Amino acid sequence: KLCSLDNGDCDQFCHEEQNSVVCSCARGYTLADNGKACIPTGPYPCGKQTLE
Amino acid sequence: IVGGQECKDGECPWQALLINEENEGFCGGTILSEFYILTAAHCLYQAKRFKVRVGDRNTEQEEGGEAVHEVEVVIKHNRFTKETYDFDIAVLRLKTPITFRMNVAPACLPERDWAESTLMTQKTGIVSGFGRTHEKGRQSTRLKMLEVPYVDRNSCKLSSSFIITQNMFCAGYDTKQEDACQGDSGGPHVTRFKDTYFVTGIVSWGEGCARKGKYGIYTKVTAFLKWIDRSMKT
Ligand SMILES: NCc1ccccc1-n1nc(C(F)(F)F)cc1C(=O)Nc1ccc(-c2ccccc2S(N)(=O)=O)cc1F
Numbered sequence: 394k395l396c397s398l399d400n401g402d403c404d405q406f407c408h409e410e411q412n413s414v415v416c417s418c419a420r421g422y423t424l425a426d427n428g429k430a431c432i433p434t435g436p437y438p439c440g441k442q443t444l445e
Numbered sequence: 446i447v448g449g450q451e452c453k454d455g456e457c458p459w460q461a462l463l464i465n466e467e468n469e470g471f472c473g474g475t476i477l478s479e480f481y482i483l484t485a486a487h488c489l490y491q492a493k494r495f496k497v498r499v500g501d502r503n504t505e506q507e508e509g510g511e512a513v514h515e516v517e518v519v520i521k522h523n524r525f526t527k528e529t530y531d532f533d534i535a536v537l538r539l540k541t542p543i544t545f546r547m548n549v550a551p552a553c554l555p556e557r558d559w560a561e562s563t564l565m566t567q568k569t570g571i572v573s574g575f576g577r578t579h580e581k582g583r584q585s586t587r588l589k590m591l592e593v594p595y596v597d598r599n600s601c602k603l604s605s606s607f608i609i610t611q612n613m614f615c616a617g618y619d620t621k622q623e624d625a626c627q628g629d630s631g632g633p634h635v636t637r638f639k640d641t642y643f644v645t646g647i648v649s650w651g652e653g654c655a656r657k658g659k660y661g662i663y664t665k666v667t668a669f670l671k672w673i674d675r676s677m678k679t
């Protein structure tokens with residue numbers, strides 16, 4: 394299912410290019426080396442509750 | 446918010462409150478970035494001059510984490526009309542940048558296709574605000590949140606005495622007494638995905654609050670992503 398199979402294992406955005414999974418992130422996040430996880434660039438990335 | 450629960454410390458950091466000249470909140474909003482707030486177009490009639498407060502959770506006193514921001518530019522969708530309530534969306538650019546901290550953070554804007562295929566197909570979303578806790582009553586002095594199930598589009602069109610346009614979507618319960626209410630307008634409707642919250646809607650309207658056979662109506666953020674992008678530039 395690619396993107397339809399558990400979001401293609403992507404942390405956030407999942408797209409299908411050349412019939413393959415391509416993950417991407419919201420602004421303020423960088424795509425990790427594994428091409429799946431999204432790494433925040435600052436202390437208050439969007440979408441994260443502030444519980445600390 | 447009728448029913449639901451109090452937003453505990455840090456649980457709804459993207460919540461914004463529009464306050465009039467008397468420093469009383471009359472509508473909610475969603476923090477999108479340090480300079481932008483997302484809200485409902487119909488709120489821009491509830492008061493002439495207004496400001497935006499962030500980091501507030503208890504309207505009674507001042508903890509010290511709250512911050513007030515003046516609005517520099519108001520961008521209301523030119524197609525909004527009270528006759529249809531369609532295009533109920535507005536973006537506010539603040540004069541000064543919001544400082545993110547405990548209880549003050551932006552919600553993520555998702556991409557259109559992904560949000561529609563992955564976010565809006567989830568079982569539920571979360572709505573929040575300082576609105577009324579009963580159909581007849583004063584605004585809540587405490588910020589509240591409520592998990593609301595996405596509602597089948599055909600089911601809601603049938604249950605509505607008003608036309609549900611493609612710029613609207615429904616969420617809530619048929620008989621369970623929980624729903625958004627007067628004052629929650631403009632507030633956030635967010636959907637969680639892997640512990641990250643994306644803005645998926647704007648509290649818009651409903652025929653009464655938590656009425657049996659009636660659902661809550663929300664502006665569909667995915668239908669205005671390009672409009673929002675253009676607004677955050679001009
Ligand atoms: N769950 C409710 C809710 C959620 C969020 C914000 C406010 C409300 N409330 N709270 C109250 C209460 F408390 F009962 F007074 C009332 C409302 C409300 O939205 N009424 C309403 C009901 C209908 C329409 C509407 C839709 C489409 C076209 C024209 C109209 S029209 N205008 O009729 O020509 C607009 C509203 F505004």
Ligand SMILES: [Ca+2]
Nearest residue numbers: 503506507508
């Ligand atoms: Ca306070």
